[PDB]
Assembly symmetry: D2
Homo-oligomer: 251 residues x 4
Amino acid sequence: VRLANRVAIITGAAQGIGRIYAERFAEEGAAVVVADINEPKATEVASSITSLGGRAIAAAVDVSDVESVNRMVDSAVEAFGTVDILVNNAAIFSTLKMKPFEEISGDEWDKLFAVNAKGTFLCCQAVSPVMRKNQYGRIINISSSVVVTGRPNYAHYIASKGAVWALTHALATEMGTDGITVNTVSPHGIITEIPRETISEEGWRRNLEEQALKRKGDASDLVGILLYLASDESKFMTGQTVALDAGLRFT
Amino acid sequence: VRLANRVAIITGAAQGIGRIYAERFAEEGAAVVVADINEPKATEVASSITSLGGRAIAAAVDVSDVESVNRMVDSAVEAFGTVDILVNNAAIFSTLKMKPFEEISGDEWDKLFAVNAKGTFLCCQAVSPVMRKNQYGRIINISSSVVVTGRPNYAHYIASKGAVWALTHALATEMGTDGITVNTVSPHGIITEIPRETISEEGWRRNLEEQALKRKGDASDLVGILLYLASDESKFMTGQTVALDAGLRFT
Amino acid sequence: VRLANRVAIITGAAQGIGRIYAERFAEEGAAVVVADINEPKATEVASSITSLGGRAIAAAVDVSDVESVNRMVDSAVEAFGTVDILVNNAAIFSTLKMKPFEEISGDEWDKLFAVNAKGTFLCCQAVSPVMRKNQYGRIINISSSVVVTGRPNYAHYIASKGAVWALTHALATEMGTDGITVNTVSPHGIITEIPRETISEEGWRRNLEEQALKRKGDASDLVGILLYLASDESKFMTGQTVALDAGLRFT
Amino acid sequence: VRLANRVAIITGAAQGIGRIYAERFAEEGAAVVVADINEPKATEVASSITSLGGRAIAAAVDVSDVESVNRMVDSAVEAFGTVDILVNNAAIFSTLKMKPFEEISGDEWDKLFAVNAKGTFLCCQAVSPVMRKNQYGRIINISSSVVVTGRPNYAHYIASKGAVWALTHALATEMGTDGITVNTVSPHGIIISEEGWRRNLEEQALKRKGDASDLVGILLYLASDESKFMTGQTVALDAGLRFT
Ligand SMILES: NC(=O)c1ccc[n+]([C@@H]2O[C@H](COP(=O)([O-])OP(=O)(O)OC[C@H]3O[C@@H](n4cnc5c(N)ncnc54)[C@H](O)[C@@H]3O)[C@@H](O)[C@H]2O)c1
Ligand SMILES: NC(=O)c1ccc[n+]([C@@H]2O[C@H](COP(=O)([O-])OP(=O)(O)OC[C@H]3O[C@@H](n4cnc5c(N)ncnc54)[C@H](O)[C@@H]3O)[C@@H](O)[C@H]2O)c1
C-alpha cells in the first residue's frame, strides 16, 4: 500500500517501462491515469489493471500539445479528484535510428524535443495548479544514462534529456514553495518487451566492462526508486537526479 | 516487512539518527545489531526494540579498532547467522567544536579520520567475507551535505566525509563482483534529540534561503531512503551518492 | 600569441561578452569571424579589431537557420582557409523577462530553444567537416550557473542550457575520434552578460553572500578560461564543464 | 611571463610531474620552491632550473610532519619574501602495489593518509597566514580520475583523494574571504605498453595519448591571475574518460 489514496499520471504508459510503472503503482494502491498517444493500447493497460482489482483509467494524450495535456489532467481530476504524482515517462527513443549527429536534420531535432523536453514541460505546467492548490505533489522526470556518458549516435536525444535534467532544477525551486518535489530518474540498460537500436553488441560489451554490477537491467530494477520518489516518504528530497545504472557511473 | 529476513548492522546506533535507523529497520522485520561505543546505551536501544516485538542485539564497538570491529561482525553472525546490510553511521559530528581550519591540530585531524574514514573502511572490510560468501550485501556509507557545500569551521570533518564518499566508489567496484552494492547517503539539516553547534541561526537563515523546501529536517526525512537502499529492491543501484537536503543543492 | 595562426568563429559577437571574446582572441593572434544577427554592428566590431592590428571579418548569422549557419562557415573558410575554434556564445537571455514557469507559452519555449539549443547544435554540425578534415578543433559551448542553482523565473532558459550541457557530452564522443575537443563554460549568471546598468552595491552584497570568493566579477574573468579552452593548452580536455562562479557552487 | 613576480611552492617536485610543474612555472617567471622528501634530488632540480636563468630553491619537506612543513614555508619566505602559489602534488601512488581492499592494513591506510590527505592539509595551514596577510593566494590540490571511476585495488589511495577533493571545498570557503582561491586538478591516472594504451584509449572520448604537458596548461591557468574568479572547482584532465 505504498501509494494508498494517491493519484498518479504516468505518460507513455501504454508499453515498455511506463506500463510497468502503471501496473506496479496500481498494485501499491495508486489510482493510475495510463496516459499515452496510443489510446487503444493505453486502454488495454488500464483494463488489465482494473481486472486485477486496481483503479485506473486510460487517457489519450499528445504531450507536445498543450490542450491535449490540459485535457489529460482534467480527465485525471474528473475521475479521481486530484493529481498527487506525475511521472513524465513519454519520450521518443525506441523508434530512433542511430546516426552521427551531422546527419540529424533540424526537423528531427525539433520533433524529438517537442515530445521529450517540451512535452515534459507542458505536463508539469498542467499539474501545477492542482498540486499547488493541494500543497502537495511528486513530479518524477526521466533522463537517461546517456546524458552523462555521451554515448554516440543519439545526440538530439541526449540533448533533450539534458533539458529535462536542468528543468527539474528550475521546477524544484519554483514548485517547492508549495511543498511539491521534483526529481529526475536516470535509467541505464533496462531491457523491456520493446526492441530498440539503442545499445549494440559492442555497446553492451563496453557497458558490462564499465558497470560495477555485471548484468543487464530490467524494469524491476527501476520500480523501487519510482515508488520511493512517488511516495509520501520522499518528502525531503527534491531537485535530485538518481541514476539506476548498475554502477556504470558513480556519483 | 520491507526488510523481512534480513540482518542489519548499524554503527553509531545508540542515539540520534542511527537509533532511529535501528528502530525503523527492526519495525520492517530486520534483525538489527545496535553497534556503538556505549555498550549499555546500545543495550537500552536493543532492549526497547525487543520489547516492541523486534529482533535486536547490542554490540560494543570502537569502529577505529580493527579487532573491535571484527568482534562486532562475529557477534552479528553468531546471533543472526549472516549480515545482509551494513550502515556506517558512526561518526564524530555532534560533539565537534567549530573552529577555523588553521586551529585544527594534527591530532584532532587524525582522531576524526580514525573514526569517520578509517572506521567506515574497517567495518566494510569486516563484513566483506560474509557478504561475498552469501553473494549478497547492502552497504550504506554516510557522508554529509557539507562535503558539497563546504560550510566553514569543520574542515577535518568535511575531509573525512569526502574520504567516505570516494571510498564508496572503490568498494562498489571491488564488491560488485559478488553482487554487493555500496552507496552513500548525504544528509542535511536533520534535527535530532542531540543538540549540536554545526549550524548557527545565521547559518539556518542561509540554508533556508538556499533550500527549495523551506523547512528544517528530521529523522523521518531520512528513513525512507535508508529503507530503499537497505532493501532487496535497490539491487541495481551501486556507487551512488543520494543527497537528502530539501534541495539545498541540486544534482 | 596564444592563438597564433588559428581561426575562430564566435557567435553573438557583436556586443556584450561575445564581442570581448572576439577582441581578446584577435589580440592573441586568432583570425576572428564576428558572427551575429546584426551584420552592421558585427562589421563595426570587425573594423575595430582590424584597425587595432587584428584580423577579423564579420558574418551575419541566424544560428537557428541551417542555411545561414552553413553560409557563415563558408565565409570563414573562404576568408581564412579553415576553422579551428567555435564559440557558441549566441543566446537569448538579456531580453528575457522573469516569469513563473506556468506563464511561459509553448511558443516562447520553442523560440528560445531554437537559438540557444538548436543554434549551438547547427553550428557544431557546420564546423564538423572542416575540423574533421584538419584533425583539429576546439568547440566551446556556454551554459550558466542558473542550471545548477535552479534560479526561479527562467525555466525555459535553464532547460535550454541543460540541453547544451548534455549536447557537449555527445559531441565530445562523436568528434573526439578526429582530435576535436568540445567543452562547456558555465559563467555565474551575474557575469553571464554585461549588464546595461551597474549592479547596485546592495545587489552586489547579496551576490557576494552566496560566493565563497568575496570578490566582484566581470568579463575579464571569463576570457582566461575561454583562451585556455580555445588553445592547444587544453588539447587533452574534452567533455568537461568549467564553472566560473567565485565558488557559488563547488565541484 | 604568466607567473612573473610570483612565488610558488610545489611539493613532491624532485621528480615526475611535480618536477615538470616546477620547471614550467620557473619558465613562466615564478620563483619556485622545489619541495620534496629527497633534498639532494630536489636540489638538482632547482640547480637545473637556476642554470637555465630561472629562480628556484630546494626545500626538504616531509609533508606529513607539521614542523617540517612549517620549515618549508619559512624557507620560501626567507628566499622570496612571500608565497603566492601552493601546489600540493606530494602523494604516495607510484610505489603502491595493487591489492584488494580487504588486504590493506589499518597501518597502510594511515600511512598513506598521513601524506596524501593530512600532508595537503598541513601545507594549506602553513601558507594561510602569509596568503591572508597579502590578500592573495592560489592553492592547487590534486585528486585523480580513479576517485570518480572507482578503479579497483587502490581503495585507500582513492579515499585519500576524496578527502583532498572535499577539503578543497572547505578551504575555498574559509580562505576566500581573503581573496585566496583553492581548486582541485584531477589528472587521468594513466599520466605503458601499446596494448595498455589501447585499453586506456577505448575508455576515452578523445582518442589521444596523454602526457605531462597535458597537465601544465591547467596548472598555469589555476596558478595565475587568469583564474582569479575560480574557486572550489575540480578540473578533470582525462580526455573525456568521464564527462562533467
Ligand atoms: N505522447 C507523445 O507524444 C509520445 C511520443 C512518443 C512516445 N510516446 C509513448 O512513450 C512510450 C515509449 O516507450 P519506449 O519503449 O519507447 O520507451 P521506454 O519504455 O524505455 O521509456 C523509458 C523512459 O526512460 C528513459 N530511459 C533512458 N534510458 C533508459 C533505460 N536504460 N531504461 C529505461 N528507461 C530509459 C526514456 O527516454 C523514456 O523517457 C510509448 O508508450 C509511446 O506511446 C508518447
Ligand atoms: N568509535 C565509535 O564507535 C564511535 C565514535 C563516535 C561516535 N559514535 C556513535 O555515533 C553516534 C553519533 O551520533 P551523532 O548525534 O553524533 O550524529 P547524528 O545522529 O546526528 O548523524 C549520524 C550520521 O549522519 C551524518 N550526518 C550528515 N549530515 C547530518 C545532519 N544534517 N544531521 C545529522 N547527522 C548528519 C553524521 O556525520 C553521521 O555519520 C553516537 O551513538 C556515538 O556514540 C561511535
